[PDB]
Amino acid sequence: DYNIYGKTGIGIIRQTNSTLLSGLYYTSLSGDLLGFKNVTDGVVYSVTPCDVSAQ
């Protein structure tokens, strides 16, 4: 259960190699948090749902 920069949710947070040069956090078209940046070293972390839809 994460509270990151005011955005709350449930998910898995992983560290990525990507380098996004702008912004602090990123959201989807539906308003869900997708990634955020550590303000000390600039590393970008991604957030994914814990459970997904299956058939």
Binding site: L21, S22, G23, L24, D41, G42
Partner: protein, 55 residues
């Protein structure tokens, strides 16, 4: 702490500071801004831009 990947600092007349595009802190509305800077690793030229809002 200063992150290693700062590339632009924008200061607004209303006191807002944008670092890499994100507003991280706001002070009181500013009337005057004194600065005195120098650098050697900024390639060949680095710019200071006075800008106004436009659509």
């Amino acid at each position: 702490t200063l992150p290693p990947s700062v590339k632009e600092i924008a200061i607004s007349k209303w006191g807002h500071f944008y670092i890499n595009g994100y507003n991280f802190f706001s002070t009181f509305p500013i009337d005057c801004i004194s600065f005195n800077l120098t650098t050697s690793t900024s390639g060949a030229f680095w710019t200071i831009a006075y800008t106004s809002y436009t659509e």
